[PDB]
Protein backbone atom coordinates (compact mmCIF):
# COMPACT_ATOMS: atom_id res chain seq x y z
CA UNK A 1 0.00 0.00 0.00
CA UNK A 2 1.97 2.96 -1.39
CA UNK A 3 0.46 6.50 -1.43
CA UNK A 4 0.08 8.15 -4.83
CA UNK A 5 2.56 10.90 -3.95
CA UNK A 6 5.21 8.29 -3.15
CA UNK A 7 4.66 6.63 -6.54
CA UNK A 8 5.31 10.01 -8.17
CA UNK A 9 8.51 10.29 -6.08
CA UNK A 10 9.74 6.82 -7.13
CA UNK A 11 9.21 7.64 -10.83
CA UNK A 12 11.74 10.46 -10.46
CA UNK A 13 14.50 8.06 -9.30
CA UNK A 14 17.62 7.60 -11.50
CA UNK A 15 18.76 4.42 -13.27
CA UNK A 16 21.36 3.33 -10.71
CA UNK A 17 23.34 0.90 -12.96
CA UNK A 18 23.70 3.59 -15.64
CA UNK A 19 24.76 6.24 -13.09
CA UNK A 20 27.37 3.82 -11.67
CA UNK A 21 28.67 3.11 -15.19
CA UNK A 22 28.77 6.80 -16.13
CA UNK A 23 30.83 7.75 -13.08
CA UNK A 24 33.05 4.70 -13.46
CA UNK A 25 33.72 5.56 -17.13
CA UNK A 26 34.40 9.18 -16.18
CA UNK A 27 37.11 8.08 -13.73
CA UNK A 28 38.84 5.78 -16.24
CA UNK A 29 38.73 8.41 -19.01
CA UNK A 30 40.30 10.76 -16.42
CA UNK A 31 43.51 8.72 -16.08
CA UNK A 32 43.61 8.62 -19.88
CA UNK A 33 43.49 12.43 -19.80
CA UNK A 34 45.87 12.87 -16.84
CA UNK A 35 49.56 12.72 -17.86
CA UNK A 36 51.71 9.74 -16.80
CA UNK A 37 53.32 12.32 -14.47
CA UNK A 38 50.34 13.51 -12.37
CA UNK A 39 49.21 10.93 -9.76
CA UNK A 40 46.01 10.76 -7.65
CA UNK A 41 45.19 9.66 -4.07
CA UNK A 42 42.41 7.62 -2.42
CA UNK A 43 41.12 10.85 -0.85
CA UNK A 44 41.45 12.55 -4.27
CA UNK A 45 39.55 9.71 -5.97
CA UNK A 46 36.75 9.94 -3.43
CA UNK A 47 36.55 13.72 -4.07
CA UNK A 48 36.04 12.99 -7.80
CA UNK A 49 33.35 10.44 -6.99
CA UNK A 50 31.59 13.02 -4.84
CA UNK A 51 31.88 15.59 -7.62
CA UNK A 52 30.39 13.26 -10.24
CA UNK A 53 27.66 12.11 -7.83
CA UNK A 54 26.75 15.82 -7.45
CA UNK A 55 26.17 16.18 -11.19
CA UNK A 56 23.80 13.21 -10.92
CA UNK A 57 21.98 14.66 -7.90
CA UNK A 58 21.42 18.01 -9.63
CA UNK A 59 20.09 16.16 -12.72
CA UNK A 60 17.71 14.14 -10.53
CA UNK A 61 16.51 17.31 -8.80
CA UNK A 62 15.92 19.35 -11.96
CA UNK A 63 13.66 16.65 -13.48
CA UNK A 64 11.80 15.95 -10.22
CA UNK A 65 8.14 16.73 -9.58
CA UNK A 66 7.64 20.07 -7.82
CA UNK A 67 11.30 21.10 -8.03
CA UNK A 68 10.72 21.65 -11.79
CA UNK A 69 8.10 24.29 -10.95
CA UNK A 70 10.53 26.43 -8.96
CA UNK A 71 12.45 29.32 -10.46
CA UNK A 72 16.14 28.50 -10.94
CA UNK A 73 17.08 30.96 -8.17
CA UNK A 74 14.97 28.98 -5.70
CA UNK A 75 16.30 25.69 -7.09
CA UNK A 76 19.83 26.91 -6.41
CA UNK A 77 19.02 28.00 -2.83
CA UNK A 78 17.47 24.60 -2.11
CA UNK A 79 20.43 22.67 -3.55
CA UNK A 80 23.06 24.90 -1.89
CA UNK A 81 21.38 24.17 1.43
CA UNK A 82 21.17 20.39 1.10
CA UNK A 83 23.80 19.06 -1.37
CA UNK A 84 25.99 17.39 1.28
CA UNK A 85 22.92 15.94 2.99
CA UNK A 86 21.76 14.37 -0.27
CA UNK A 87 25.24 12.90 -0.80
CA UNK A 88 25.17 11.39 2.70
CA UNK A 89 21.57 10.20 2.37
CA UNK A 90 22.32 8.57 -1.01
CA UNK A 91 25.43 6.93 0.48
CA UNK A 92 23.55 5.59 3.53
CA UNK A 93 20.74 4.14 1.42
CA UNK A 94 23.22 2.32 -0.83
CA UNK A 95 24.85 0.81 2.24
CA UNK A 96 21.48 -0.46 3.45
CA UNK A 97 20.12 -1.74 0.14
CA UNK A 98 23.13 -3.00 -1.87
CA UNK A 99 25.74 -3.23 0.90
CA UNK A 100 26.71 -5.24 4.00
CA UNK A 101 28.27 -4.48 7.40
CA UNK A 102 32.07 -4.34 7.21
CA UNK A 103 31.98 -3.13 3.58
CA UNK A 104 31.44 0.17 1.73
CA UNK A 105 29.32 0.05 -1.40
CA UNK A 106 30.74 2.80 -3.58
CA UNK A 107 28.77 4.88 -6.04
CA UNK A 108 30.72 3.27 -8.91
CA UNK A 109 29.02 -0.01 -7.93
CA UNK A 110 31.78 -2.06 -6.28
CA UNK A 111 32.21 -2.96 -2.61
CA UNK A 112 35.48 -2.38 -0.79
CA UNK A 113 36.41 -3.42 2.76
CA UNK A 114 35.71 -0.53 5.13
CA UNK A 115 39.13 -1.23 6.66
CA UNK A 116 40.82 -0.57 3.32
CA UNK A 117 39.41 2.99 3.08
CA UNK A 118 39.63 3.80 6.81
CA UNK A 119 43.30 2.72 6.96
CA UNK A 120 44.16 5.40 4.35
CA UNK A 121 42.42 8.08 6.36
CA UNK A 122 43.36 10.17 9.40
CA UNK A 123 41.39 10.41 12.64
CA UNK A 124 39.01 13.25 11.71
CA UNK A 125 37.79 11.41 8.62
CA UNK A 126 37.71 8.09 10.51
CA UNK A 127 35.51 9.77 13.12
CA UNK A 128 33.10 10.95 10.38
CA UNK A 129 33.11 7.51 8.74
CA UNK A 130 32.23 5.87 12.10
CA UNK A 131 29.24 8.13 12.71
CA UNK A 132 28.08 7.44 9.15
CA UNK A 133 28.49 3.72 9.85
CA UNK A 134 26.26 3.99 12.95
CA UNK A 135 23.57 5.76 10.87
CA UNK A 136 23.77 2.94 8.34
CA UNK A 137 23.42 0.41 11.17
CA UNK A 138 20.48 2.29 12.71
CA UNK A 139 18.69 2.48 9.36
CA UNK A 140 19.52 -1.17 8.57
CA UNK A 141 17.86 -2.24 11.82
CA UNK A 142 14.86 -0.05 10.91
CA UNK A 143 14.45 -1.97 7.62
CA UNK A 144 14.89 1.26 5.67
CA UNK A 145 13.26 0.87 2.25
CA UNK A 146 13.16 2.72 -1.06
CA UNK A 147 9.77 4.37 -0.34
CA UNK A 148 11.11 5.81 2.91
CA UNK A 149 14.33 6.84 1.18
CA UNK A 150 12.60 8.90 -1.51
CA UNK A 151 10.44 10.66 1.08
CA UNK A 152 13.48 11.58 3.19
CA UNK A 153 15.24 12.89 0.04
CA UNK A 154 12.32 15.23 -0.69
CA UNK A 155 12.17 16.32 2.97
CA UNK A 156 15.87 17.18 2.81
CA UNK A 157 15.54 19.00 -0.52
CA UNK A 158 12.39 20.95 0.35
CA UNK A 159 13.85 22.27 3.59
CA UNK A 160 11.94 24.74 5.78
CA UNK A 161 15.20 26.36 7.02
CA UNK A 162 15.97 28.02 3.68
CA UNK A 163 15.54 31.80 3.86
CA UNK A 164 14.87 34.21 0.97
CA UNK A 165 12.92 31.72 -1.14
CA UNK A 166 10.54 33.37 -3.57
CA UNK A 167 8.05 30.51 -3.64
CA UNK A 168 8.44 29.46 0.03
CA UNK A 169 4.79 28.29 -0.03
CA UNK A 170 5.32 25.57 -2.64
CA UNK A 171 8.31 24.44 -0.56
CA UNK A 172 6.25 24.33 2.67
CA UNK A 173 3.48 22.60 0.70
CA UNK A 174 5.85 19.87 -0.49
CA UNK A 175 7.29 19.33 3.01
CA UNK A 176 3.81 18.88 4.52
CA UNK A 177 2.62 16.56 1.75
CA UNK A 178 5.66 14.31 1.74
CA UNK A 179 5.49 14.25 5.52
CA UNK A 180 1.83 13.13 5.42
CA UNK A 181 2.59 10.49 2.78
CA UNK A 182 5.44 9.06 4.83
CA UNK A 183 3.18 8.91 7.89
CA UNK A 184 0.59 7.01 5.83
CA UNK A 185 3.13 4.64 4.27
CA UNK A 186 4.57 3.57 7.66
CA UNK A 187 1.22 3.11 9.41
CA UNK A 188 -0.14 1.13 6.44
CA UNK A 189 2.99 -0.94 5.77
CA UNK A 190 4.67 -1.24 9.19
CA UNK A 191 1.63 -1.19 11.52
CA UNK A 192 3.31 -3.06 14.42
CA UNK A 193 6.17 -0.55 14.57
CA UNK A 194 4.38 2.70 15.36
CA UNK A 195 7.83 4.13 16.23
CA UNK A 196 9.04 3.75 12.62
CA UNK A 197 7.78 7.16 11.41
CA UNK A 198 9.52 8.94 14.28
CA UNK A 199 12.76 6.97 14.01
CA UNK A 200 13.02 7.91 10.32
CA UNK A 201 12.51 11.66 10.87
CA UNK A 202 15.01 11.78 13.76
CA UNK A 203 17.77 10.56 11.42
CA UNK A 204 17.46 13.87 9.55
CA UNK A 205 19.14 16.09 12.22
CA UNK A 206 21.93 13.49 12.43
CA UNK A 207 22.38 13.57 8.65
CA UNK A 208 22.44 17.40 8.74
CA UNK A 209 25.13 17.33 11.49
CA UNK A 210 27.37 14.78 9.76
CA UNK A 211 26.98 16.77 6.54
CA UNK A 212 28.10 20.04 8.18
CA UNK A 213 31.11 18.25 9.69
CA UNK A 214 31.98 16.73 6.30
CA UNK A 215 31.87 20.18 4.68
CA UNK A 216 34.08 21.78 7.36
CA UNK A 217 36.60 18.96 6.95
CA UNK A 218 36.53 19.13 3.15
CA UNK A 219 37.05 22.90 3.21
CA UNK A 220 40.12 22.31 5.40
CA UNK A 221 41.32 19.72 2.87
CA UNK A 222 40.67 22.20 0.04
CA UNK A 223 42.57 25.05 1.72
CA UNK A 224 45.35 22.56 2.40
CA UNK A 225 45.82 21.93 -1.34
CA UNK A 226 44.55 18.32 -0.99
CA UNK A 227 41.42 18.49 -3.11
CA UNK A 228 42.16 17.94 -6.84
CA UNK A 229 40.41 20.31 -9.25
CA UNK A 230 36.71 19.58 -8.75
CA UNK A 231 34.55 22.39 -10.08
CA UNK A 232 31.08 21.48 -8.79
CA UNK A 233 32.08 20.09 -5.38
CA UNK A 234 34.11 23.24 -4.57
CA UNK A 235 31.48 25.57 -6.07
CA UNK A 236 28.97 23.90 -3.72
CA UNK A 237 31.45 24.07 -0.85
CA UNK A 238 31.82 27.85 -1.50
CA UNK A 239 28.03 28.26 -1.24
Amino acid sequence: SIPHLILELLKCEPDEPQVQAKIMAYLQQEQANRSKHEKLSTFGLMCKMADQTLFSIVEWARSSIFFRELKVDDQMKLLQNCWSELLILDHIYRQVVHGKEGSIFLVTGQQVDYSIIASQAGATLNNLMSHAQELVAKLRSLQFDQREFVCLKFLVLFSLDVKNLENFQLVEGVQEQVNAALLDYTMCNYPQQTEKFGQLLLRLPEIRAISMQAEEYLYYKHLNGDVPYNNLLIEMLHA
Binding site: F55, V58, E59, R62, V72, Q75, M76, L79, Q80, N231, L232, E235, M236, H238, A239
Partner: peptide, 13 residues
Protein backbone atom coordinates in the same frame (compact mmCIF):
# COMPACT_ATOMS: atom_id res chain seq x y z
CA UNK B 1 25.78 32.90 -7.74
CA UNK B 2 27.28 29.60 -8.89
CA UNK B 3 27.43 29.94 -12.68
CA UNK B 4 27.97 26.18 -12.83
CA UNK B 5 24.96 25.20 -10.72
CA UNK B 6 22.86 27.66 -12.74
CA UNK B 7 24.12 26.14 -15.99
CA UNK B 8 23.43 22.55 -14.82
CA UNK B 9 19.86 23.59 -13.98
CA UNK B 10 19.09 25.69 -17.10
CA UNK B 11 20.82 23.74 -19.87
CA UNK B 12 18.25 22.19 -22.25
CA UNK B 13 19.49 18.65 -21.59
Amino acid sequence: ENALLRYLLDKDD
